[PDB]
Symmetry: C3
């Protein structure tokens, strides 16, 4: 469900923010999570992060905009809390 | 082939045990290997490891239980040896 | 487009050579890039790197041969520069 998606993305971002995983690990993990649920635009945003064209804050902003366009309410709160933590 | 799958999974786990790769790298690599061979339940178990809901030992235990119902004998030996190393 | 593919592969190899990512991260990233563009032989070569049967130089060599067979010209230049940087 979309609750487990939000929980997993929030957990991955939490491990990134505590220093347990680095930027490439975060990119790979979050892109895999997004691909496993069928959301490809978010996967493209994480692909842009993985390449290096954007940073974590930019990726979070574009992910929040895409979630707004997709109506993923549980993921919007996770992304906003992550944005304010950075 | 199933022997090559067992060889690659064993090599990845041996890399993790020595200290060459960490938990996230091992999760991503083993999930990729399992997805490349069409074993989806094993992929879900490695996904739970990547999320953070289980550890390496628990993942090995559930992987062995799932490989028992699949008839992957070489993978069973690989997982048993990896379990006893831990 | 094949220009974006070559750009991303060159960028990933450049991060590897600068030392900001390691061998497993490079393998995962380059395999993901190759799979996202529908090139499977390149993906198999990167998979062989991921397991540990070949190193980065050998992978770059076989990737160059595969790109010669596929007629991808920008990838050839990227791989040649990466080979000579090693
Ligand atoms: Zn991708
Ligand atoms: Zn998965
Ligand atoms: Zn693969």
């Amino acid at each position: 469900t979309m609750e487990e998606l939000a929980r997993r993305v929030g957990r991955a971002i939490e491990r990134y923010l505590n220093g347990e995983i680095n930027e490439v690990e975060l990119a790979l993990a979050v892109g895999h999570i997004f691909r496993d649920y069928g959301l490809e635009e978010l996967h493209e945003i994480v692909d842009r992060l993985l390449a290096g064209e954007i940073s974590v804050l930019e990726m979070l902003f574009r992910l929040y905009e895409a979630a707004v366009k997709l109506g993923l309410d549980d993921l919007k709160f996770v992304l906003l809390k992550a944005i304010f933590k950075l």
